[PDB]
Amino acid sequence: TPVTLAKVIKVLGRTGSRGGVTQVRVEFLEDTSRTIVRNVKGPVRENDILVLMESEREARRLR
Amino acid sequence: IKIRITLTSTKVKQLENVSSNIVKNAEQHNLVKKGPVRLPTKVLKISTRKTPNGEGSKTWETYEMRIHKRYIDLEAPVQIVKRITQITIEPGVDVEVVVA
Amino acid sequence: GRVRTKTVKRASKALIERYYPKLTLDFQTNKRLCDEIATIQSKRLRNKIAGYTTHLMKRIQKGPVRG
Amino acid sequence: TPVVLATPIPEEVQQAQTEIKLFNKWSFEEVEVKDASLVDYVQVRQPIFVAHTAGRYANKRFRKAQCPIIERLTNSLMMNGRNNGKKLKAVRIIKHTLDIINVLTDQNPIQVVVDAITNTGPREDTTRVGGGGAARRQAVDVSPLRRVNQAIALLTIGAREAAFRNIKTIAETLAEELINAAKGSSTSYAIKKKDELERVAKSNR
Amino acid sequence: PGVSVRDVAAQDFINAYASFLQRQGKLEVPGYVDIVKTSSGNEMPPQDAEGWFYKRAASVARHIYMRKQVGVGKLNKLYGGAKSRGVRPYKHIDASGSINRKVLQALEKIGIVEISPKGGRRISENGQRDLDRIAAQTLEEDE
Amino acid sequence: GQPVNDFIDTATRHVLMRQGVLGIKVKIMRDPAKSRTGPKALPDAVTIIEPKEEEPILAPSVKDY
Amino acid sequence: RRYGKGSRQCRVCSSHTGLIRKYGLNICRQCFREKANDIGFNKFR
Amino acid sequence: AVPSVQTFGKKKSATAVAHVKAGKGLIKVNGSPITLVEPEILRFKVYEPLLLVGLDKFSNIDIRVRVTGGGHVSQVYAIRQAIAKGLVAYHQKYVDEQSKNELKKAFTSYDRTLLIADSRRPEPKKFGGKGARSRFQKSYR
RNA sequence: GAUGAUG
RNA sequence: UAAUUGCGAUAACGAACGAGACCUUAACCUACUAAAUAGUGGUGCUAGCAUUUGCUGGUUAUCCACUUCUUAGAGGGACUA
RNA sequence: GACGGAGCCAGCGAGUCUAACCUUGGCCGAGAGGUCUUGGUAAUCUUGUGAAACUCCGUCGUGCUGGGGAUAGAGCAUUGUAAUUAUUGCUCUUCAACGAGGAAUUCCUAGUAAGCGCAAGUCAUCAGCUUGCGUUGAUUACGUCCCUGCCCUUUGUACACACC
């Protein structure tokens, strides 16, 4: 299957019961002007490029 | 006459008053000397448990006592050494003099 | 943290109300004035007191400060 | 012409006076890997000599990104306790392993390391989520820095387990682990584990 | 240019000199070399039962060169090792005095070392000539 | 802090009664302003010299000599 | 008597146990703490 | 008198006293050529100052170092720093400023330890454990 | 918005 | 904010202990005062190897000078400028 | 990785009055140790405490094996009036459990964890202990209130021995 790439444009604060996840807003490299909210497992900053296996999911949150 | 003037104490300020008094006293007489050679400080230690009975969390305490030895070499006649040994009595400082 | 205590905030406050003309916007000069103007018991405290005073002169430059 | 000095300095070392090569052999001027999501977290843009730097990279959050990836591979071999410390063995073991790689493949040995890493970082992982005690996994993404960190772990862990009670010396097991991983071959222990984690991550979406 | 012993690696020099003494055959071998072990810390005798003695003599000859004076004690320390002690942990254990003594006695007879004031042995004039001649030989064989 | 070893004197004594022993502990804090040797006040005290009143000039003047 | 635990005693309380002998003080550990200020052993670090 | 300069460098307990004077390119550590430094693997650390600038700069100078204290690794870091500092102190006194600045730029851009010592120092052990921050195992039953 | 008695 | 640390608000106003200050110890000073019971260099005597004025060494009863490395006394330095 | 030869580097400390202490050096012995001298009441001597891990070159070659040295026999020495229920040290022989460990559970955020040893306390003798010291030196957070607990406010209580 293919993969798609997006770029973090903001960090929206830690999530997870034990604090191990981070909430991020991404920006697709191609067909930009589409932005999704999803979760990350390790340390993450702005400008980092992520490899999303699938695109159309959006992440739950504690609030 | 050659002399060595070893000084010692457990409190520097007094040791400095007596030693500095020695160099000023000699320099007005324009004697020849080796300035005060300050030897390394030696620090004693006693580490012991705080508790006097052997119960409670294991906790240790450390103490210290310090020694500030100096020595000064002089070359002066006898008539002046006689009084050099008699000047500068200050509590807390021990002074010893070795001739030749 | 870099939060000063009241023994620093008040000491600097007393200096400005009595020595504004002589203070400047420079740490080093203010360091030497505090030796001629106030009796302080340590090098550490003296640096901190002067440092806040410099910070307050900068505030007064942009506009008056309450207190 | 090479400089002449009162104390002789061999000519082979004097050749490095115009460019820096790791262990005096392998070069840095052609190594780039296409995975665009990791160009900011694999340090192959500052050449070094001996893969022994003594850097202060633990004091701030992301400073470990600037450590050359060759030394961060070196650093992970000092494990399973008895070998904690003993960094010199690590500098020597990396030396043998690289020489082996260029024998077995005729490609730049550093390039093999960067390719193997970029093919091993798991893209999708999972976390435990629940309330009151009942626990179920959840699908999440994986950050750039962490793909490198976990990539090296799988590589040195796979090489080390192989070297145990096995005739092949440590330098080799890492050499064959690295060759396969960059080849994207299921025989590699690193790639096996990347697929297993991703498969579980997909079932729990 | 010239040459000094310090201009050649220790391993290269020690191997070259041990061969030389073995060949000339003018150094005394104490005879019980085939029985003893060089330090109590060890658990087996040296492997090279042929030329381990001429190897020890090669090291000690150089060691005097570098320093001013040495003794049986300095050499017990220098060649000491870590005892095992089985269940209990390790500890430094000094080497064998007899070997390190009879090497020092042997060296004087062949003329490489002489006693010196302050105690301990000392590199003699002759010893320097012996060790430096060979040094130039090792370097010349860099091919 | 250090001021304890500078400005405090203490003593602990035992007293014998028919009920049983009991202890008395006394602490005296000497005034630092009166100190003959050592610091003259606590580490955290700051005092400022009162400035002298100054009046401006009328017009610049020079004095000859 | 020429050696052993019983050859020695605290110079203050004649206790056989805990005696500290470094620097030839020969005082028991409980007694050292009380007398340290006067003996000259202060507590710094 | 012959032009000369003195410098030093440190890491942990290692200290290397480097003496420099105008000469013919001699470079020696502890009375042996630089080439014979040990442990072998870390030798290119000792070479590092010579390469990063160019062997040309060393042709007219003699450097003799003597190192004491520390261990087999910290010493090699003392040696390289004594060589780097010695060369820049020689250009400080006997050559123009523009050259001194450029030489410091080459070292700084590569590895700050060649000029400025490492600030790290060890921490004391505390009672109740085997080390600075480790503690003995605890038991409840 | 699993389970969690007792001295 | 590490802090009942401060900004402030305000039927409370002004104070006291605790924290901070403080003391010890570690990191810098080619700046001060010195120092064969610490070191470095020069010169005397001197071994070995080359030899053009070299490389490495020895000499505590041979001397002289000096203080980067070593000891301290007294200071400087960081205050987030 | 074990073993055998070479390479070869610390810092904190300690040391002789109602007296034998730290011990260089020469000689003897495989070792332990013995013996004649010597320096130190100490930045002077022991002490560059030539420590261990370490590096280099070789023997071994996945084999309970040259990993491990527990358990036993036999002799040789030191300290002490006196060691047998072996104080300890040396030498040869014996050469077991252990193939990475179930539920559980402990410590740790950098010269830190972890690896390696040295001085001191104890001492006539005996560290697998403790207090310090250095030497080699990573991986992983820069967060959270899920578990275990702490601090402040609000709220309910039939608790006051105070949620046991």
From Swiss-Prot, chain A:
InterPro entries: NA-bd_OB-fold (IPR012340), Ribosomal_eS28 (IPR000289), Ribosomal_eS28_CS (IPR028626). GO terms for biological process: cytoplasmic translation; maturation of SSU-rRNA; positive regulation of nuclear-transcribed mRNA catabolic process, deadenylation-dependent decay; ribosomal small subunit assembly; ribosomal subunit export from nucleus. Coiled coil: none annotated. N-terminally acetylated by acetyltransferase NatB. Keywords: Acetylation, Cytoplasm, Ribonucleoprotein, Ribosomal protein. The keyword Heme does not apply. GO terms for molecular function: structural constituent of ribosome. CDD domains: S1_S28E. It is found in: Cytoplasm. It comes from the Eukaryota. Pfam families: Ribosomal_S28e. The keyword Lipoprotein does not apply. GO terms for cellular component: cytosol; cytosolic small ribosomal subunit. PROSITE patterns: RIBOSOMAL_S28E. HAMAP family: Ribosomal_eS28. Component of the small ribosomal subunit (SSU). Mature yeast ribosomes consist of a small (40S) and a large (60S) subunit. The 40S small subunit contains 1 molecule of ribosomal RNA (18S rRNA) and 33 different proteins (encoded by 57 genes). The large 60S subunit contains 3 rRNA molecules (25S, 5.8S and 5S rRNA) and 46 different proteins (encoded by 81 genes). Belongs to the eukaryotic ribosomal protein eS28 family. PANTHER family: 40S RIBOSOMAL PROTEIN S28, SMALL RIBOSOMAL SUBUNIT PROTEIN ES28. Present with 8600 molecules/cell in log phase SD medium. This is Small ribosomal subunit protein eS28B. It comes from Saccharomyces cerevisiae (strain ATCC 204508 / S288c). The lineage of its organism: Eukaryota, Fungi, Dikarya, Ascomycota, Saccharomycotina.
Swiss-Prot record, chain D:
It comes from the Eukaryota. SUPFAM superfamilies: Ribosomal protein S7 (SSF47973). There is a cross-link at K25, K183 (Glycyl lysine isopeptide (Lys-Gly) (interchain with G-Cter in ubiquitin)). GO terms for biological process: cytoplasmic translation; maturation of SSU-rRNA; regulation of translational fidelity; ribosomal small subunit assembly; ribosomal subunit export from nucleus; translation. GO terms for cellular component: 90S preribosome; cytoplasm; cytosol; cytosolic small ribosomal subunit; ribosome. It is found in: Cytoplasm. Component of the small ribosomal subunit (SSU). Mature yeast ribosomes consist of a small (40S) and a large (60S) subunit. The 40S small subunit contains 1 molecule of ribosomal RNA (18S rRNA) and 33 different proteins (encoded by 57 genes). The large 60S subunit contains 3 rRNA molecules (25S, 5.8S and 5S rRNA) and 46 different proteins (encoded by 81 genes). Component of the ribosome, a large ribonucleoprotein complex responsible for the synthesis of proteins in the cell. The small ribosomal subunit (SSU) binds messenger RNAs (mRNAs) and translates the encoded message by selecting cognate aminoacyl-transfer RNA (tRNA) molecules. The large subunit (LSU) contains the ribosomal catalytic site termed the peptidyl transferase center (PTC), which catalyzes the formation of peptide bonds, thereby polymerizing the amino acids delivered by tRNAs into a polypeptide chain. NCBIfam families: PRK04027.1, uS7_euk_arch. This is Small ribosomal subunit protein uS7.
From Swiss-Prot, chain G:
The modification Phosphoserine is found at S14. One of its GO terms (molecular function) is structural constituent of ribosome. It is found in: Cytoplasm. Its cofactor is Zn(2+). It comes from the Eukaryota. Binds 1 zinc ion per subunit. GO terms for cellular component: cytosol; cytosolic small ribosomal subunit. Zn(2+) binds at C10, C13, C28, C31. Keywords: Cytoplasm, Metal-binding, Phosphoprotein, Ribonucleoprotein, Ribosomal protein, Zinc. One of its GO terms (biological process) is cytoplasmic translation. Signal peptide: none annotated. Component of the ribosome, a large ribonucleoprotein complex responsible for the synthesis of proteins in the cell. The small ribosomal subunit (SSU) binds messenger RNAs (mRNAs) and translates the encoded message by selecting cognate aminoacyl-transfer RNA (tRNA) molecules. The large subunit (LSU) contains the ribosomal catalytic site termed the peptidyl transferase center (PTC), which catalyzes the formation of peptide bonds, thereby polymerizing the amino acids delivered by tRNAs into a polypeptide chain. Belongs to the universal ribosomal protein uS14 family. Present with 6490 molecules/cell in log phase SD medium. There are 2 genes for uS14 in yeast. This is Small ribosomal subunit protein uS14A. It comes from Saccharomyces cerevisiae (strain ATCC 204508 / S288c) (Baker's yeast).
Swiss-Prot record, chain H:
Residues 121-141 are annotated as: Disordered. Residues 132-141 have a biased composition (Basic residues). Keywords: Acetylation, Cytoplasm, Isopeptide bond, Phosphoprotein, Ribonucleoprotein, Ribosomal protein, Ubl conjugation. It is found in: Cytoplasm. GO terms for molecular function: RNA binding; structural constituent of ribosome. Component of the small ribosomal subunit (SSU). Mature yeast ribosomes consist of a small (40S) and a large (60S) subunit. The 40S small subunit contains 1 molecule of ribosomal RNA (18S rRNA) and 33 different proteins (encoded by 57 genes). The large 60S subunit contains 3 rRNA molecules (25S, 5.8S and 5S rRNA) and 46 different proteins (encoded by 81 genes). Belongs to the universal ribosomal protein uS9 family. Present with 33800 molecules/cell in log phase SD medium. There are 2 genes for uS9 in yeast. This is Small ribosomal subunit protein uS9A. It comes from Saccharomyces cerevisiae (strain ATCC 204508 / S288c). The lineage of its organism: Eukaryota, Fungi, Dikarya, Ascomycota, Saccharomycotina.
